[PDB]
């Protein structure tokens, strides 16, 4: 998931990975910074529980 390009050791940020995986469900038109927060905080509280 962190690696997408074979012949370049630069890596993709994980927030780009989730934002891409939202588009296969439905094509996201407008994206906001607030949507990143509520996904992440519910994710981090899920792992702690």
């Amino acid at each position: 998931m962190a690696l997408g390009s074979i012949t370049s050791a630069v890596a993709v940020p994980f927030s780009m990975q989730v934002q891409a995986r939202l588009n296969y469900v439905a094509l996201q038109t407008d994206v906001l910074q607030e949507n990143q927060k509520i996904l992440a905080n519910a994710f981090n509280n899920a792992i702690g529980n």
């Binding site: 094509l27 038109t29 407008d30 994206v31």
Partner: protein, 49 residues
């Protein structure tokens, strides 16, 4: 393949993830995108010549 206008959905944001483009170089990128206003002035001067 070359792009057509039917592959582009129009939204309002165009964040930094996109490709920076101006009006004149849009028309050589995509095929058969025809702004009619520049075209009609060509056949107008060709008619009265």
């Amino acid at each position: 393949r070359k792009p057509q206008m039917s592959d582009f959905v129009q939204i309002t944001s165009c964040e930094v993830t996109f490709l920076n483009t101006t009006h004149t170089t849009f028309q050589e990128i995509v095929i058969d995108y025809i702004d009619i206003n520049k075209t009609i002035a060509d056949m107008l001067e060709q008619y009265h010549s």
